[PDB]
Amino acid sequence: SMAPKLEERLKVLTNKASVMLFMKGNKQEAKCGFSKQILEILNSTGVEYETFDILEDEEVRQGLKAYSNWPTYPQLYVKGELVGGLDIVKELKENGELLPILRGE
């Protein structure tokens, strides 16, 4: 029951870059917590990625939860599909699976 205009805005945003991070804050100042922690992990990978600050856009903050059926932030997207949040990204990192996922494999 999502409005088609919101569906479109969210599909566009999630494809804004190959690797796209929805977070509290931005690359210069991430909110203490899960958003800052995931930024640190992404940084250590050396991959190019972009961020979007869901604290400054409530429509996207609430919309993306419905769009991705995922209740929390941060949300990492790769090639337009949800990967997950910090817990998933850490698990991937632990298993040596994070880099392949960031390259779309």
Ligand X SMILES: *SC[C@H](NC(=O)CC[C@H](N)C(=O)O)C(=O)NCC(=O)O
Closer to Cl ion at the Cβ: 25 or 85? 85
Q: How far is the CB of 32 from ligand X (least distance, A)?
A: 3
User: What is the C-alpha separation between 60 and 69, in angstroms, rounded?
Assistant: 13
Burial of 78 (C-beta count, 10 Å sphere; 0-12/13-18/19+):
buried
Query: Least distance (Å) from Fe ion to the CB of residue 33?
Result: 3
Identify residues 13-42 at the interface with Fe ion (CB under 5 A): 33-34
Options 2-10, 15-23, 28-36, 82-90: segment touching Cl ion (CB under 5 A): 82-90
Separation between Cα atoms, residue 5 and residue 24, nearest integer Å = 24
Contact pattern from residue 21 through residue 40 relative to ligand X, giving x for each residue in contact according to CB under 6 A and a dash for the rest: -----------xx-------
Determine, following the binding rule CB under 6 A, whether residue 2 of this chain makes contact with ligand X: no
- What six digits make up the tokens of 89? 């990204």
Residues in the chain: 105
Strands (E), the chain: 19-23, 50-53, 75-78, 81-84
Residue 60's identity, in one-letter code, is V
By the rule CB under 6 A, 80 interacts with ligand X: no
Residues found near ligand X in the complex (CB under 6 A): 32-33
Binding residues for [2Fe-2S] cluster: 32
